[PDB]
Design a protein around this ligand. Sequence first.
Ligand SMILES: Nc1ncnc2c1ncn2[C@@H]1O[C@H](COP(=O)(O)OP(=O)(O)OP(=O)(O)O)[C@@H](O)[C@H]1O
Ligand SMILES: Nc1ncnc2c1ncn2[C@@H]1O[C@H](COP(=O)(O)OP(=O)(O)OP(=O)(O)O)[C@@H](O)[C@H]1O
Lengths: 550, 550
Amino acid sequence: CFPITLKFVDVCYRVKIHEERTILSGVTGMISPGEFMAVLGPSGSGKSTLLNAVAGRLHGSNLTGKILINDGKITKQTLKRTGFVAQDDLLYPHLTVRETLVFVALLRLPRSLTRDVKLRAAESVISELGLTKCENTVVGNTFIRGISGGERKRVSIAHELLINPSLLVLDQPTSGLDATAALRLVQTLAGLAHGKGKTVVTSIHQPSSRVFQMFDTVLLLSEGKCLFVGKGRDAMAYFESVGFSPAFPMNPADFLLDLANGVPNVRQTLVTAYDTLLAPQVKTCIITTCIATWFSQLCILLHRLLKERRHESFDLLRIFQVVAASILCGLMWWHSDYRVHDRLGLLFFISIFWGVLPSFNAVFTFPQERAIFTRERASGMYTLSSYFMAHVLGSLSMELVLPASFLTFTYWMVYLRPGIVPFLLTLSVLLLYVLASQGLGLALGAAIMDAKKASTIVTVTMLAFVLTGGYYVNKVPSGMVWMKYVSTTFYCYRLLVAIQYGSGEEILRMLFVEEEVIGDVGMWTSVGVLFLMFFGYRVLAYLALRRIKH
Amino acid sequence: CFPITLKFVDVCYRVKIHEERTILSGVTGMISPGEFMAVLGPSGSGKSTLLNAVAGRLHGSNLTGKILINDGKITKQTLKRTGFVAQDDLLYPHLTVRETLVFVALLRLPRSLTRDVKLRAAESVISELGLTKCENTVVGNTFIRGISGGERKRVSIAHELLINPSLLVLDQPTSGLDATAALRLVQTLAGLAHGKGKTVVTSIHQPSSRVFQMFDTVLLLSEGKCLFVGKGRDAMAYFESVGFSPAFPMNPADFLLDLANGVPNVRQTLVTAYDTLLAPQVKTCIITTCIATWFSQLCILLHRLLKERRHESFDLLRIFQVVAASILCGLMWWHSDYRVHDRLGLLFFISIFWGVLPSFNAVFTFPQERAIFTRERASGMYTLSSYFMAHVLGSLSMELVLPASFLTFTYWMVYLRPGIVPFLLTLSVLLLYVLASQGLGLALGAAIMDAKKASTIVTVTMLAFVLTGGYYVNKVPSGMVWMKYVSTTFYCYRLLVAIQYGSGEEILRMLFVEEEVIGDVGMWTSVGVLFLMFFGYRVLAYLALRRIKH
Ligand SMILES: Nc1ncnc2c1ncn2[C@@H]1O[C@H](COP(=O)(O)OP(=O)(O)OP(=O)(O)O)[C@@H](O)[C@H]1O
Ligand SMILES: Nc1ncnc2c1ncn2[C@@H]1O[C@H](COP(=O)(O)OP(=O)(O)OP(=O)(O)O)[C@@H](O)[C@H]1O
């Protein structure tokens, strides 16, 4: 019941010439709750920069104004009561529209309500916006042909009607629908402000006259400076104080947008007849359930993420290629015996393979979710902890079956140390190393939010780890022995060599000894550092995601 | 001067319920040259599927109709005379709008004209659409804040006015501009059909009445079936034959879209009053400069691609990380001598590094250009040969300076074979191997147009090449010796070992001999296969790009 009163005074936004050009220059206005606003202007004006300014999405040293919610600046608490509908529609392309609106319903409604109230509120906004025939079809990308471009927008307004916010900042909501859905959409957005008493800000672009009668305070913009702030029928008459009237009966909207360019420099005489005639008048007018919440927000964000990857049939081919690589690694060391250089080669090639394959595929988790994650993080839907521990729990379904299907062939074809306990110890060490190296691909990929930029960082880093993982050079300079402890391949190599060759007495009985496990690190201080790396790379991937608010 | 007469008869398009739903059902119409059409309807109708059908962009077993240009089906020759302006605007985000319109001007105009005619035609469409104040600013992505959303559309119509096509199929051109740029844009598209005599098809959505007076044949659609085909003022009067008229004076457009839904099942009585009253009336109405062209199309597509990567300052950091990895590889083998296992380790780690780093970064060239390349390839702007030999010549500027900056440190810090001829032979073999392995990342990445799907194919393939590149296993089964010839790491390893250790007599004098160059392959039949691979992987990357027409 937060009564948002939005007041902006003298906001200016200048970008560098890439001098500087003024996008906005001196915009003032007051939006008390109940007032249905409208931001009009030509297609270069500064409307969407003003709407990205008052919705908090624009911050920086460029803005030289004061945006005030309830006579205070924009906090983080008011940024979860403000609903923002952007121009471009960024949605999850593999869901349908019913799963999208159901997940936004279940994740954002007050949680004191039962589940069927949370579903009837989701299918009470589908019938209100008219998305009933496209209810059970996909909302896909440019390539994945899904729903229309006018239903990819009526979904992205019901995406923010299931928040019930107190300040509704819509950025061109109806540019994309016909003239009989525009009227019903503005009837909805006016029944949310002459009904439930909210604060609605619209940037409508090409209205009719009976879509213009619904507005209570129109902001007419022109090249950054505003021409009019005030009522609907006071416009089309305020411009008779300066002497501009149509010669024949037309709509008010195309006339107010004809005067917005100058259709003897009409624009500047309206700007100076604004600034001193009717601008000083607006200058005188101005715990135990906190856990259950977090676990429901994990079940939802995991059930969505497991619906995203049911479309992907490029996982049987991943399994069949890793099986082929395992058959290769088994058939080449087929003629190996237990007695050791030829086997340390295999136990280092496994450490190369499963530090290179998970870390080079984990750089596509967070960069490929960026355009939707920034939007949902700015909106304030879920917590970042519950979002991060859904990708973490979503990778751990097929990043545990590929090394198991690898090792199930390449153990019993090479005929390594027989018995079920060294096999299970080898499999557990391989799975722990895979999860430890996947954290590196998570962290480089959350820190540099670009798959192409991070794929040449993680490649050089994993090759430096493969280099200083104890196999290649014999006599390393002793001021540089310390680097193999920072490696992640070193611990897995030491553990695999330890598991296969004991602490080493039976080999010293049968038969160098230098890089075989009679050596440097123990067996528990090499699983105590793999677990530390598995936790620390994910803590760093969370801390590098905490910076992305925008 | 191709006089396109577009005629579609009984086109139906059904998608599977993911039974089947009819998107379109029985659409007929004739567009002779000079007729300015308009496709109207509600926001679920089947307009953009009809416009993707008649512009050739929809093909498949779903379409059960006949699209006819000049009483013949759509060839590839007519697909370079048809201009299609899609709903979503896919543009190159790093250019400005002036470079974008200049490159489309220089690349598509008849080439018999001089260059300044080709530039005055480019800045004669900027002033016509009004893009003069946003002429020299960027057109960037969702992240890169560039021009507006109404200037990201007035650019994507001047993108297809600099073709001068004979059939102009616009898909919602004005949904995004105000009511005084809509009138001027439809004045332009009507002066292209009452002027230069073309065939213009528009899907306008929210028109005025004086944007509706410009239309010569309106197609009113409703839920896939069409309600009206014919003149402008014959609509608003044909619906008086069935008995629907407004009670008070309004625009024709909102009335024709109010009847399009049923505002006693009005929609079906209009469909059956269409099908037998005024549908049978339309059933009765129905060399040495060829090289210079290709080289100009290479200079343009290369000067654009070198403008795309001037924004990237993440290349000094690539150079500084590869320099750090080289300093690492030098400092670890700092204590190496010329006399050989410790050096074959280094000559195989270089072969690992420069087969892993180029092939894992070359998978982002063609998947990251996909959404714009499919559009330009469907449009018919450049040839695929000249497009492919611009990415090929664009990678070869920093995929030749990273191995040189690597080797310049890691040769003289390890102190390998001294002299300028083994150094230059090593550098040339390294550059040839880098270009040979970059072709693998090109081919897997053109074949599977997804960076995430191809990054787990190229990783397993390069690890299989590293495995069967002659270093790891000692006694491979002899039915599997043949696999190292398919490898690309094997030839570079053999060449580096040959260059450093001769054919081998001085080492047999100073001092195994088995995997040192006294061995299997020669020195010329290992550069004759690296060149074959360098050509064959790029031929496969061209053949896998030839399938993407869409
Ligand atoms: N980062 C930037 N750098 C340079 N110029 C910019 C930048 N962002 C916006 N502009 C310019 O400032 C003007 C205002 O942009 P804005 O997004 O407000 O337009 P708009 O009113 O949203 O357009 P429309 O109403 O057609 O969507 C635009 O014409 C644009 O060219
Ligand atoms: N691949 C598909 N699978 C299932 N349904 C589809 C598919 N493509 C389109 N549709 C449905 O068919 C209808 C027609 O889509 P179309 O793109 O023609 O709408 P439109 O007329 O372009 O909408 P608008 O005019 O608002 O842009 C849409 O409502 C959409 O839901």
